[PDB]
Amino acid sequence: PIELLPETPSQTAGPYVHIGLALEAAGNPTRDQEIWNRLAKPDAPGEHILLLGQVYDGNGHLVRDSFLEVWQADANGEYQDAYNLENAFNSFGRTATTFDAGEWTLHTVKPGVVNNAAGVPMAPHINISLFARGINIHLHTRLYFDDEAQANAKCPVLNLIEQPQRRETLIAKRCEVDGKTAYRFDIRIQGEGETVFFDF
Amino acid sequence: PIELLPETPSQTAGPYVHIGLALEAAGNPTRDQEIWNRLAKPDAPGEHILLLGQVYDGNGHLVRDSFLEVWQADANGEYQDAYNLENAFNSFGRTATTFDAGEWTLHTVKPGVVNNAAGVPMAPHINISLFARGINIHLHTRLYFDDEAQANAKCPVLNLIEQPQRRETLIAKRCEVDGKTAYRFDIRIQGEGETVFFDF
Amino acid sequence: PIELLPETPSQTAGPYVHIGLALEAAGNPTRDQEIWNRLAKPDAPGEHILLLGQVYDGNGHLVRDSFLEVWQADANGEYQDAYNLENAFNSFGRTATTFDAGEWTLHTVKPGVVNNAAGVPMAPHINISLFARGINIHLHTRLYFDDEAQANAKCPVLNLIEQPQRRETLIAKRCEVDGKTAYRFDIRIQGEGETVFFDF
Amino acid sequence: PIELLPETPSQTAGPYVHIGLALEAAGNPTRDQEIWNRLAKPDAPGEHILLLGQVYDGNGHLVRDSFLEVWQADANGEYQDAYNLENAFNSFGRTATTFDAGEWTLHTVKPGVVNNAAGVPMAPHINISLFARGINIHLHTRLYFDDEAQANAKCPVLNLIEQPQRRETLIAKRCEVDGKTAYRFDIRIQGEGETVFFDF
Amino acid sequence: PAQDNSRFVIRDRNWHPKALTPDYKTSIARSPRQALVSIPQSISETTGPNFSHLGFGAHDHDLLLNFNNGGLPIGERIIVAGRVVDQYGKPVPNTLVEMWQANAGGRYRHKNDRYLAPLDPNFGGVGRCLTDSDGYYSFRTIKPGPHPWRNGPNDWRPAHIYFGISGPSIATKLITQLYFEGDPLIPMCPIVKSIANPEAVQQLIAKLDMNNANPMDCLAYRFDIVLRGQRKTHFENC
Amino acid sequence: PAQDNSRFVIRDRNWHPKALTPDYKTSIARSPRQALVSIPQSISETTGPNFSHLGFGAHDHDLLLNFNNGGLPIGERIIVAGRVVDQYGKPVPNTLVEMWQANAGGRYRHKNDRYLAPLDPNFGGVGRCLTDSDGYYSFRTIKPGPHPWRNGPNDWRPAHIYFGISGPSIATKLITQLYFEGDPLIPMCPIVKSIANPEAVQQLIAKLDMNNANPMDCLAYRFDIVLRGQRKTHFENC
Amino acid sequence: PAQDNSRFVIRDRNWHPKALTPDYKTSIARSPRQALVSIPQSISETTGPNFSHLGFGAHDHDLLLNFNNGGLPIGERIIVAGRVVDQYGKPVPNTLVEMWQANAGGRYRHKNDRYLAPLDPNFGGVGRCLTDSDGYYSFRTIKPGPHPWRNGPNDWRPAHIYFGISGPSIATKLITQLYFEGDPLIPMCPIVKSIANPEAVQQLIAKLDMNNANPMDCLAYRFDIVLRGQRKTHFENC
Numbered sequence A, B, C, D: 001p002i003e004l005l006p007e008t009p010s011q012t013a014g015p016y017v018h019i020g021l022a023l024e025a026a027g028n029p030t031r032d033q034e035i036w037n038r039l040a041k042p043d044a045p046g047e048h049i050l051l052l053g054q055v056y057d058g059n060g061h062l063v064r065d066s067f068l069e070v071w072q073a074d075a076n077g078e079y080q081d082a083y084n085l086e087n088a089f090n091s092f093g094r095t096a097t098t099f100d101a102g103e104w105t106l107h108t109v110k111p112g113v114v115n116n117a118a119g120v121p122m123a124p125h126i127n128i129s130l131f132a133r134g135i136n137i138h139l140h141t142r143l144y145f146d147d148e149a150q151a152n153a154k155c156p157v158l159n160l161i162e163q164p165q166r167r168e169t170l171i172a173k174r175c176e177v178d179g180k181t182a183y184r185f186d187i188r189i190q191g192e193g194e195t196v197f198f199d200f
Numbered sequence E, F, G: 001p002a003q004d005n006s007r008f009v010i011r012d013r014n015w016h017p018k019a020l021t022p023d024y025k026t027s028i029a030r031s032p033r034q035a036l037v038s039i040p041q042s043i044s045e046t047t048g049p050n051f052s053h054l055g056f057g058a059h060d061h062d063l064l065l066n067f068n069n070g071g072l073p074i075g076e077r078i079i080v081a082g083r084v085v086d087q088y089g090k091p092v093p094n095t096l097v098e099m100w101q102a103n104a105g106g107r108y109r110h111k112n113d114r115y116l117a118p119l120d121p122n123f124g125g126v127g128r129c130l131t132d133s134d135g136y137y138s139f140r141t142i143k144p145g146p147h148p149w150r151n152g153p154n155d156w157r158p159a160h161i162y163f164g165i166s167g168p169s170i171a172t173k174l175i176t177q178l179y180f181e182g183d184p185l186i187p188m189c190p191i192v193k194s195i196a197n198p199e200a201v202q203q204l205i206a207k208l209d210m211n212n213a214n215p216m217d218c219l220a221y222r223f224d225i226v227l228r229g230q231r232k233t234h235f236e237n238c
């Protein structure tokens, strides 16, 4: 059969991933421009939301050295690929878990609906890639919203998960943090309540 | 790189280990001198204690054919390698689980403090090696004592166990048995509450 | 390690190099445009000079079939790569030794100063490449000028020649020839007074 | 035939040999005890002599980074192998050429006569091993004395040199340096007047 | 905004390291036990950030100068250079390449690294660059030292530099580690050996590149990166 | 008392059998699922009992006479001898070697063995010896027979003798099984095959040793044992 | 005083590098053009200094501590250890072993080295030791970096450490260079290649020695040295 050049193989990002990709977290000075966890400036259109979460291993212990990358549509359901710290909104961001508490945060807007390749609307989602010590190739997941039940029920991606119980692992929980709209999205890498991870 | 002679590979001690190493348990006559579970004669200095425990497999069932070797300091925190049945104290002993109840016992004294190689004091501990049918290479563990909580908290070996919850698996529980101080140390080879095992 | 395509290997230019590169010298008719030994027309700016020399082998005998290529800056210390017979000055030229007397000549201007890559000024020089029967790969040298002694003393290229006595082999001697400034630059391929040859 | 383990092959001592073997010369602090160029304390028996010399390459240029080791009998013709800085005499020493002048010096006594393995007396000599950048395996020679003409003429080692002219290269020249007895021993590694080097 | 116009060749997850590779001990509890769920590519997966207008500092790619505290760092001066292409051999221009590493002694400038080898006051350990219009990148740095780590009782990472590459979509994004030609620690490392196929391991070994060295100055290593092949959509929804 | 002045070469746990070797069915539930925790060697690990003054009976090493109930045991009379050395090739003198086995028919003298082949009234199946000043040990015994067992539906252990060796510390202590040259059961046994590397398996196969036989009396097998290499500490705490 | 009681196996001067090796440019003018003159061994050649009573400082073999100016040197912590034997395999005890090297960046602490890589304020680059009664030596140091040099236009020495060994006589005295396992610069170096026989080059390559490493601390390399075989005189002058 036809064989292409093989892809460069993945390796773990390691425990010191912050040196390279989360400079403040390593305890190091930052450069003039850094790619970080504030996707939306205050005057970006859409519903402004705080996202937060913890990451658990198979023994139910916090993964305190997690590194996360996120990709989401703007409030109008459009992906903005021209990354610029001047923009009121960027579709891409990065975050990491605190070493003490194990919590990551993101400041963004709720993404609008995007259609799949067949033209079927997907429920509002944030694409997440998870990297860490002990993770040899990053894990892909999606964060959906518990206040989008009707859309979630119809999502052609959610519906590819064979067991209904597992779909629940991708639904973030709406709450309030200091009077502001928030969602919690915990990830369980392994075992009871294991988060669905995707291949594509 | 430099390659030495390879070590002889381990194999399971098998279900009839008792034939060779626990003669009575096998159902067989003993020789005049046997290495067994009484490390201390009544005259040995230090606090005389009974140790006992059960061993569980990954399904929570008793491992009724366990064989254990132990190595511990005397009450001064000194290892006594000159093994002699005439000695009031020996640092080494052997025990096995009953086929009926599955309980092993040891009669010894509480060991004194020993420093690690860097000069940092280790909490009082008994080194244990566990052999049985189904165990291809013996499992190493340590028995620490729950009446040493302050010392255990600073032990540089316990502190190498990354998760605090796992350190609890090595702490034997003090009780009284027929008016004598005793500690129970149960070992869980696999699963919920799995005992920490070491490599060195 | 990374291995590139190998370079085409050199071979001697042979005793009949003139057939291809010095047509007159071969005894043959010339084409309308030839690359030869007059780098400067009378109108070229700078100090007009005659260069001449003989080439000796290891037994002290004339190399009567030498072919030389030269490359030098103009009087401003700028290299002029746009070769054109219409130009008042060209940075490149060719010459050959007479089969009878064994002398080559060049008509040019004294080059200006050129800095090395580190910004340090090099003394005025002519780059020379020498080809002949018996020379398997051409020999690189530089012609410097004895009326530039103070500049020569500080040249970072001459100063890479570890022995001061060897630097003298690269210094052409100023004379007058038919009322015009001339310099003699003799080359000794081998033995006593062997000319410094470069690799770069 | 019988083949033994091969000897570890030699390599050049390099231009920075002084770092390791001539600490002051490198421009570095010395240790408490160093092996250096004073073989004899003032009160050692025998005729006290200064030795000095320069080392030349094949182009007649000074070898300014030479390192020399010497081995000689005491005045009574006995080799003293128990090296100790307390001793009034040591049979072994080290020296090196100055980077500016290219001169090495030694302070010693004139060695007494030593017999070869056949019982034949050898003329007074100092054994010398020469190391340097560009010397892949050290060169062995001997320094004999011009005021020992009768002994030199009869030396069974000198007489193994087939040409009389070459024997002269090993004879040091008696002089006076500040009213004190001295000998000059120059070494020519290559070419005219090339010093005899030994294999043994 | 970005659009769905391409498809990316499916990953070979037997070429990449698997999730559960127990000799690398931390992988045991940090690997999923359920199968990944395969989903079709949509605009969510086939688009990604372009960093053309991220503002890079003058020395962002030069670790000899980007942590200057009064001198040069100690250690083997090297250029690390290479090309980013996709599996069809097409160059990947204007893509973000990030790298980080320990110093010459294997010590990382991170609060969590307590290895006893000292920090270097003039070494930070982070670089970033955008590939040029032909897919090439280059960094200047010092060769990192091996690093012991608490895996087995005497485990040592080979000298390595971490690389992150964005590529044209979140589907192409990759983090990997570069190793150095000939390092005798490579065959022994449980992180290297998370990769089951020895030919895949070879893809992570940077080759000494004398052709790219600066004489009397710095050596050079070459590390080419291959991202997932990108093709146009064809015969979809018909 | 004992002192911490030595270090022992780290075990290769891919040379040894792994814990989880599912074809050996009892290993499935009796293998840890969490990684072992590496700890540095201290005096607790680098010391161990010396049995120089354990009192041995006259026949402790002689299984033809140590269960004498009126006659000799039935079966193939053999000496089993060899040397205990460490990985540096250094002999291990005055070390305890214990061995046990089934009889000629594969029946063990243990209350839990119900195999139908009979016990031998003059065979017990246990020996022990201290190595001499040069590391050598010697037993006289009967060659054990293969033993069926409830693993797969028709599994049979090759003839084997269990060995336990103390060595200089609890870090060197080992239990293993000796097998016999040419036994066609060896490649089929899931306990043998718990060892992944076939070269490691070869290290457990005792070789027929005619040079050590007693003519007209007993054959001999040779089984050398290699314990972890022991070295002095160097450059610690500085 | 010393006496003539032994003979030393003649050197193989096709095993050692020859004097004239023109790719190593400085050898051209510093090699004799006349043949060496062979002489028989006498007491002059078969004796040599013994350094048993040279006074060594506490840190003479420890380059991590023997140039202490307020910290540890930067770079890869290693032990360099090995045995000195003669060609008959006999150990060479109580012999002087001296070594020197550049720092982690290939910079030598010598007034004549102007390479632009910085000096390390806590690294000197010199060690010495006497072999023990069994012929073993050991040093602790940092792995030296490659060094460019003005030979060809882009020539770089592999990482190397200079060694000088006295041995029992001036006839055995040797200076050589140690190289490191796998270094891709080794095949390219005109100084290495002064040695014509590739098997001889292999003798100078120190092997990674995980067995001798200090976990969480320092790696180790092994470099054994073989000096000329020493035998008794026999049937001389008869």
Ligand SMILES: O=C(O)Cc1ccc(O)c(O)c1
Residues within 6 Å of the ligand: A014, A015, A016, E147, E148, E149, E150, E157
């Ligand atoms: O977990 C640890 O001990 C730290 C560690 C290990 C391996 C690495 O490659 C690394 O960067 C850090």
Ligand SMILES: O=C(O)Cc1ccc(O)c(O)c1
Residues within 6 Å of the ligand: B014, B015, B016, B133, F147, F148, F149, F150, F151, F157
């Ligand atoms: O499976 C059991 O419990 C019986 C058994 C099997 C294999 C052996 O080697 C052995 O001695 C005993």
Ligand SMILES: O=C(O)Cc1ccc(O)c(O)c1
Residues within 6 Å of the ligand: D014, D015, D016, G147, G148, G149, G150, G157
């Ligand atoms: O001659 C030079 O440029 C210096 C130099 C070259 C090679 C070496 O190994 C060395 O230590 C020093």
Ligand SMILES: [Cl-]
Residues within 6 Å of the ligand: none
């Ligand atoms: Cl191209």
Ligand SMILES: [Cl-]
Residues within 6 Å of the ligand: none
């Ligand atoms: Cl030996």
Ligand SMILES: [Fe+3]
Residues within 6 Å of the ligand: A014, E147, E157, E160
């Ligand atoms: Fe790392």
Ligand SMILES: [Fe+3]
Residues within 6 Å of the ligand: B014, F147, F157, F160
């Ligand atoms: Fe058995």
Ligand SMILES: [Fe+3]
Residues within 6 Å of the ligand: C014
């Ligand atoms: Fe021709």
Ligand SMILES: [Fe+3]
Residues within 6 Å of the ligand: D014, G147, G157, G160
């Ligand atoms: Fe060098």
